[PDB]
Amino acid sequence: IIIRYLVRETLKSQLAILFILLLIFFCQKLVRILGAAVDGDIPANLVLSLLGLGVPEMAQLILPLSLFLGLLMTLGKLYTESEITVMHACGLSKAVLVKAAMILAVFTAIVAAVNVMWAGPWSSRHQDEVLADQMDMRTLWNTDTDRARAELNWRITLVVTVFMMALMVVPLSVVNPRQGRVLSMLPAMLLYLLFFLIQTSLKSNGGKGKLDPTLWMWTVNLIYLALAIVLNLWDTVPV
Amino acid sequence: ATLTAKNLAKAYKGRRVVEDVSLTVNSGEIVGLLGPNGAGKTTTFYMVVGIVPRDAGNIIIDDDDISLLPLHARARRGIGYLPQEASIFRRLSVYDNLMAVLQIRDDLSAEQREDRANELMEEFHIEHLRDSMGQSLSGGERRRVEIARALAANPKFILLDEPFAGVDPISVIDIKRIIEHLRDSGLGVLITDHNVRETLAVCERAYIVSQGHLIAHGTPTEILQDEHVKRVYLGEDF
Amino acid sequence: ATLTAKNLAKAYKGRRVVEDVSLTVNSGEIVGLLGPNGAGKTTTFYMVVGIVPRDAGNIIIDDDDISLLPLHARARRGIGYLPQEASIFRRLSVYDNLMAVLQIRDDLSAEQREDRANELMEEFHIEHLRDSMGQSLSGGERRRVEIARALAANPKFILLDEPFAGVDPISVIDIKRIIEHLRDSGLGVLITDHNVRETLAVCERAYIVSQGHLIAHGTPTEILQDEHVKRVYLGEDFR
Amino acid sequence: VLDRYIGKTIFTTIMMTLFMLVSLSGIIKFVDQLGAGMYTLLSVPKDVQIFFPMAALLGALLGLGMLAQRSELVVMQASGFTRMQVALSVMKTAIPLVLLTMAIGEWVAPQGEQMARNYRAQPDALSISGLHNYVKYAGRYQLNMWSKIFQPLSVAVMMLMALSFIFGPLRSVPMGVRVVTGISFGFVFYVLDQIFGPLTLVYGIPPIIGALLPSASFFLISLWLLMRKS
Amino acid sequence: MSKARRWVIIVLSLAVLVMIGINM
Ligand SMILES: CCCCCCCCCCCCCC(=O)O[C@H](CCCCCCCCCCC)CC(=O)O[C@@H]1[C@@H](NC(=O)C[C@@H](CCCCCCCCCCC)OC(=O)CCCCCCCCCCC)[C@H](OC[C@H](CO)O[C@H](OP(=O)(O)O)[C@@H](COC(=O)C[C@H](O)CCCCCCCCCCC)NC(=O)C[C@H](O)CCCCCCCCCCC)O[C@H](COC)[C@H]1OP(=O)(O)O
Ligand SMILES: CCCCCCCCCCC1=C(C)C(=O)C(OC)=C(OC)C1=O
Ligand SMILES: CCCCCCCCCCC1=C(C)C(=O)C(OC)=C(OC)C1=O
């Protein structure tokens, strides 16, 4: 009952971020592609379909972000409304908050696993034909067992990041009334943003052949997963 | 039971906000904790609850030291807490947020959860609101649901934080009726607030902690006749 | 002078929260405005101050209708407002607090304000503090400089919003001493506190409203021996 | 005097936000090593020219918002002050701000940026006077003149806008919501500058007023939030 | 707000500004 309440309350806040953040990403997709069609190709037959076919690429970044941000909105609201303090006062641990986050990251990581194979390569096997080897945007997951810049390590880490960014927000959405409620999101929002600035500069920097994206792309995934666990098990004897 | 708190202390950035406060409360006894707003009564109250960690001291609930335990671990061993502000579960039914904390008790069977829930609505006159969720609930009817579901966790020592907090004087008759009803069920109530005139009417004894340490304790008759209290607090009370 | 409201009404959405509340504040008179919470004793207070705009009322100081005016044009006719928060000018001196509002009055010459300020700050015994700012002054001078500052704007009808409001009973005697001194200078004052034990002990008339309108407008010893206030409000035991 | 106290509180937080926004984008501008090349130090007064209409909005939302949350914005208008002569006190501290973003955008940011690009030798952005009577022989190079001559006018518009929704719908919000709004409306001003920049010549015909639409459309929101909602 | 919570937001946002300067 108290787990179905936390899931139903975050899901209404997660589907409201996915509509606001979709228009924010549409306008960034509209600011750019005018500038490649105002002194480039003609914006008469493509400007409404080139916008709508780059959606499963931009949904790779807003499906982990809306569950991250939707749990900061929902858990941060119940801390200020004194619903989580009185939840511990009747007696039940923070494992209810973790068992409600991972039962909700499963709902997102099976949309972000349908989007990452045969819904993502489809919109690059259709967006690059209307303009008429080493591409790695139209190959599916089985035929991505080539050599030489086969970047499936960035298509797997977009599904593991749904689980390790749902573990980090249950101890980082503790609202302190003295700091405020937006000042308390700052160690969380900077930690998610630092994760995507490292993996983007390891996918492209590892695409030239400067450092292989198996050692260094899963070291960051395991440093951040081990950070998710010490933060969640901090209430014990000193170590 | 005999919840005892011994030699408690705290320092916020070097400032000694409380030194050597020792208070006990037994089962079936209203006990108050009041005094001026110099840090005092609030940090001492939030050590027995557990949402402020102590610097030095001991909390024991009659047999065993629970001073190093969080709030959810003290709630399994007795101690039950009511926040001052509105803490009812928001988009949940009144029967649902009574059952949500009645589901965590593993010493019951799933039919005894339903018998206890219908026993708690009729005890607090709530049973005409079981499908109605909150935010259709008034100020006096939200308060009965919070005490009915703090009693669903089966506590000893419900300790209330400012249970008056701004209510009209016909609504202090009904709060003090269900506070004296918990005492008649064998629960040791510990109250702190600002309103002096309405807790010294309901408490059997009271601790006055002012400027750090504890300055007096006793029955509310001999509290009023005390002279060291009378200077820093209660000049010409009644 | 006399400040009178007449047939005040206010409706947000369907439910009229105020209907036909008429009060009268004469000079040299504490008068209270009381009732249960949410009944409309704090809406019919702000309708006299000027924050909440009226719907059908007539706010009148002795010969001018001020029911259409905002708060700043109402404060020049002789209405003073003391909010229940701190509201002292923090990073500004305690002599410059009085000089801040003494420069607004256009009937004082530029040297005639620096002896009116030097007169107000010794009547209220706040002359030993002269450069202490106000972000750390006291609790006892976050209530007495603001009265000297609200008196420096030359009011006739100073309106106190929740004066007692969570102070110790050793400090209630001090802020009751400066309300009775406030009307010894010929100044009608309206109080709207919730702690109805001293705002019936400092006042001479009271204006119990409950859920839309007036119930009683007698002396405090006339409301205890009433009957209809004793069912929606105080109870059956107040002595 | 407290005309000199509203203005002193605002001016301190404009220059505190602007020093923050320049130090942030100076460590990002430490990109050109990818060892003691001070390219980012002589390009400081160009960064001051770029972040000044945004530090004006964010710094005045932060300085008036702390006057409102300390309740000293209603206690001076309940003792006098009209809402016009508190608006006139944030314009009296806007004239030294306008006389600084056109005094360094013509004397310092020309000669500082050019002497850095020459030191790093291992839209013809020169000046408002250098581009004046430069191109004769319609195109793009005149829009860089109009988006630079009343770039100081966009500072006074954003200080008026940061006051229009302090009296409007941000007087009783927490302080973090005002900062998030100040960043979000600093994103819209980027969008209106680079999407009304080209498109007002290539898919339409504003000759001069195409550079006005960033400032003219944020002036209409300012007089809609204090007049129609009053 | 603290001594260790403040010194995280200084250090963690210093590494974001370095990582923005890396991929530009
Ligand atoms: C309410 C909702 C509204 C809608 C919101 C949604 C829609 C938004 C739509 C538009 C989105 C962006 C589209 C885009 O597409 O942005 C693209 C790239 C995608 C960017 C998406 C960015 C925004 C966020 C999206 C999500 C939002 C929710 C680039 C482009 O398009 O530009 C690309 C261009 N780079 C940039 O501009 C920097 C480029 C940097 C990009 C980083 C990308 C990775 C970002 C991760 C961000 C995570 C955020 C959480 O970021 C930019 O653009 C960003 C521009 C907006 C900044 C807004 C303020 C940010 C800070 C706020 C305060 C903290 C690049 O480098 C050239 C290199 C700079 O060193 O030199 C330039 O000049 P110079 O050196 O010659 O002088 C650059 C110089 O440096 C500089 O100014 C100095 C710094 O670096 C500036 C850095 C940015 C500001 C930082 C401030 C501190 C921030 C701290 C933050 C913690 N200077 C300019 O360009 C002039 C502009 O005035 C700068 C404007 C900066 C903002 C303030 C002023 C606004 C205008 C004036 C008002 C008066 O070359 C490319 C190829 O061409 C050859 C070119 O194109 P292309 O992409 O086509 O290849
Ligand atoms: C807690 C931070 C966000 C606060 C939003 C206002 C919260 C307090 C009133 C909430 C509320 C509303 C509005 C409400 O409409 C309702 O219905 C059953 C509630 O039920 C218990 C509520 O708690
Ligand atoms: C362009 C600037 C936009 C600023 C937008 C701020 C939006 C704040 C929304 C706050 C909010 C949250 C989080 C929220 O969760 C909620 O309800 C469940 C609200 O209900 C009325 C809210 O208002």
Numbering used by the authors:
A (entry chain F): 2 to 133, 247 to 353
B (entry chain B): 2 to 239
C (entry chain A): 2 to 240
D (entry chain G): 6 to 39, 51 to 138, 246 to 260, 268 to 360
E (entry chain C): 1 to 24
From the paper:
The IM component LptB2FG comprises an ATP-binding cassette (ABC) transporter, which powers the transport of LPS across the bridge. The cytoplasmic LptB dimer binds and hydrolyses ATP and the transmembrane (TM) domains of LptF and LptG create a cavity to accommodate LPS. LptB2 constitutes the cytoplasmic NBD dimer and the six TM helices of LptF and LptG (F_TM1-TM6 and G_TM1-TM6) constitute two TMDs that are arranged to form a central cavity with two surface gaps between TM1F and TM5G and TM1G and TM5F termed as lateral gates. To understand the mechanisms of how LptB2FGC recognises and acts to transport LPS, we obtained high-resolution cryo-electron microscopy (cryo-EM) structures of LptB2FGC complexed with substrate LPS or ATP analogue β-γ-imidoadenosine 5′-triphosphate (AMP-PNP).
The cryo-EM structure of sfLptB2FGC was determined to 3.1 Å resolution. However, due to possible flexibility, we are unable to see clear density for the periplasmic domain of LptC. In our structure, residues M1, R5, I9, L12, V16, M19 and N23 from the TM helix of LptC interact with residues Q293, L300, L305, L304, L307, L311 and T314 from the TM5 of LptF, respectively. In contrast, only G21 from the TM helix of LptC interacts with V36 of TM1 of LptG. Comparing to the sfLptB2FG LPS-bound structure, the presence of the TM helix of LptC makes the lateral gate TM1G/TM5F of sfLptB2FGC structure much widely opened, along with the neighbouring TM2 and TM3 of LptG and TM4 and TM6 of LptF moved outward, resulting an enlarged central cavity. In contrast to the two recent publications, a density for LPS is identified in the cavity of sfLptB2FGC with all features visible as in the sfLptB2FG structure except the inner core of the LPS. Interestingly, the LPS molecule trapped in the cavity of sfLptB2FGC is about 7.3 Å away from that of sfLptB2FG structure referring to the position of the 1′-phosphate group. The LPS molecule in the sfLptB2FGC structure positions in proximity to LptG with kinked acyl tails rather than drooped as seen in the sfLptB2FG structure. In the cavity of sfLptB2FGC, we can also see that hydrophobic residues L17 and M24 from the TM helix of LptC interact with the bound LPS, suggesting that the TM helix of LptC is also involved in LPS recognition. The number of residues from the TM helices of LptF and LptG that have been shown to interact with LPS in the enlarged cavity of sfLptB2FGC are greatly reduced compared to the structure of sfLptB2FG.
